[PDB]
Subunit: 175 residues, 4 copies
Amino acid sequence: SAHTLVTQEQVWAATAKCAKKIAEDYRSFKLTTDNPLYLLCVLKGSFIFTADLARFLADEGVPVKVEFICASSYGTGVETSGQVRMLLDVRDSVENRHILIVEDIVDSAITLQYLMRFMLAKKPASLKTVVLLDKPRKVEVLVDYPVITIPHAFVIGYGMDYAESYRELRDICVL
Amino acid sequence: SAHTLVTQEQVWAATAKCAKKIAEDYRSFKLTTDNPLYLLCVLKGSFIFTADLARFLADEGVPVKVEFICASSYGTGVETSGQVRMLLDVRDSVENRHILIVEDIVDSAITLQYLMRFMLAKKPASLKTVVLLDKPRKVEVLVDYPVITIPHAFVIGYGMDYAESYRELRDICVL
Amino acid sequence: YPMSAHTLVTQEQVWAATAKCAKKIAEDYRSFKLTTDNPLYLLCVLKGSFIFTADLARFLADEGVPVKVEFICASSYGTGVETSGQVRMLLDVRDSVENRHILIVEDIVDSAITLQYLMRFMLAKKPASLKTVVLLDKPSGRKVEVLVDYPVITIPHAFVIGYGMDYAESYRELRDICVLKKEY
Amino acid sequence: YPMSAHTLVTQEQVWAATAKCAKKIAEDYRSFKLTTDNPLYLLCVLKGSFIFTADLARFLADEGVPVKVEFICASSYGTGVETSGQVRMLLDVRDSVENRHILIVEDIVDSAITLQYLMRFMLAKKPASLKTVVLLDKPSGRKVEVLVDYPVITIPHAFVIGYGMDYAESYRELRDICVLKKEY
Ligand SMILES: [Ba+2]
Ligand SMILES: [Ba+2]
Ligand SMILES: [Ba+2]
Ligand SMILES: [Ba+2]
Ligand SMILES: [Cl-]
Ligand SMILES: [Cl-]
Ligand SMILES: [Cl-]
Ligand SMILES: [Cl-]
Ligand SMILES: [Mg+2]
Ligand SMILES: [Mg+2]
Ligand SMILES: [Mg+2]
Ligand SMILES: [Mg+2]
């Protein structure tokens, strides 16, 4: 009851173009291993994207550190702020460091802005964002590196779930 | 090898004056149980203060909800931002709610400001602070309700530790 | 107190009970030669235990018992729990408790299985001893009672507020232990 | 790779090993009638296991095995750990794992006691089965080896970087498993 939307080779092809585009944008920063690009992986749905994107960034000679954050939605009392409860926070300080928030798909603009405000509180040198799936409004202003464009659809596979199932599929499918 | 600095009855006497002062300041807000004053208890050192202050706030007819946060210091890479790693975050949304950060003593201005930035990201109606022990500089601008003034000293008791020991003492002592 | 139908135990009654319990605890651990460097660890289960922890620690101070305090916080799962009572740890202890004496501090035992899980959790840290102290012992058969070691106030079954315990996150700040009026 | 003295296992070598391991896993759980609603849970120990988890899950997908993924993250304690290997849980699983089949996913077994603790931790959630998969099996006597169930690549003792594994939080992004040059 699922149809393929993007195959692994397509996702890889798109992620690899994204990696070169990232690599050329951060050239002017002279990144090093003591001052790398930090990949901020938002669990769970981003973990396979992060793993593949990291290695594509290695292909470009970009130095990478990998941080994970995990947050839980509130049942009530969130209207305009996208507040989520932080369960896992970064192991390393990110003061004056270059952060790339790695998302699979922007479910909630306002919740994305909240996470951005949370990281901005940590005084980073730069905050930018890379979203695997981009369905094209005026909250594209929040997304810097949209990897692949898709129509409005409930998707699974490639780390993304329906009810915790199907994260393990190589291709991205729709329901 | 410890001398008493403040006895329980003194701490209580001061906290009770603070509770009335708080109660009269938030009168203009018409607090209710659906819109209370949230006490943000910064673990561990504040837990006994919070427990006593809450009940003093009950004496004033202030409605109270109690949140806990726990954060760990970074070993390296923090210079100007007071970044700490959040281990426990609030169970309730605080959007448009009245928050009172409950500290025992301001060890680090910049780390206090970081926690303040973290809460401010959650869009509260008001953010204010109450610090049990206040040693009198220009970061008094960060402290709204200093309960008791003391000289520069390493203190223990009343929830406050030296090496996790002595939180359980009724009186505040110095070393 | 306007939201209280009955008052169940007053602040003064709770303290007196807790002072008695602290002396029972201090007698039971005299043989164990507790030091500052090998104290009794108070495991405050958040949130409900926190006022009770703050007072019980000070009654233990009266008894001359060296203490340290650790906090844990666990969230319940939406489904898939039947026999095990597992909960998602959101905050684990800051100090290792290997070969230490731990007292799990609880306000009420509302699920014996989850209490059992918390203990299995704690027993995996290989403590020297593990006991529990429950402020409100509510009606229970042998299954629960073998879990609780130090019941402070034996109490009939009711909806309690106050003394750290909540209704819809409200009323923890009350000085007395109250019964919530039906019209909440 | 400039920071690499030797190359230990290449990306292509690791995949081939992991595909073989995934088929061994899929044969071993055929009897258990794994469903979407009763799958094999992958317990990714952060951070080092994450690239390995992402690839191993997709090799399990090739084998037709239904998966779910949970992450845990634990910090080491400064002191007071000797026999128990306990670690402070910073992230516990999001789903209950009561009566489920769990595979702890590890990059290397660097402390048998801490691996034992993680298992005691997991065994308290009363899973239906608990097994471990380790990408790099390094030299070890019977003590460790009885803990590891599915070793992917048997390997000599060295300082590895790449494929998720780090030096000073650097080099996780490398496609190959490398040996760090002495002059780091
Ligand atoms: Ba996501
Ligand atoms: Ba403090
Ligand atoms: Ba409780
Ligand atoms: Ba590992
Ligand atoms: Cl198809
Ligand atoms: Cl596209
Ligand atoms: Cl004195
Ligand atoms: Cl004063
Ligand atoms: Mg989802
Ligand atoms: Mg301290
Ligand atoms: Mg409750
Ligand atoms: Mg490491």
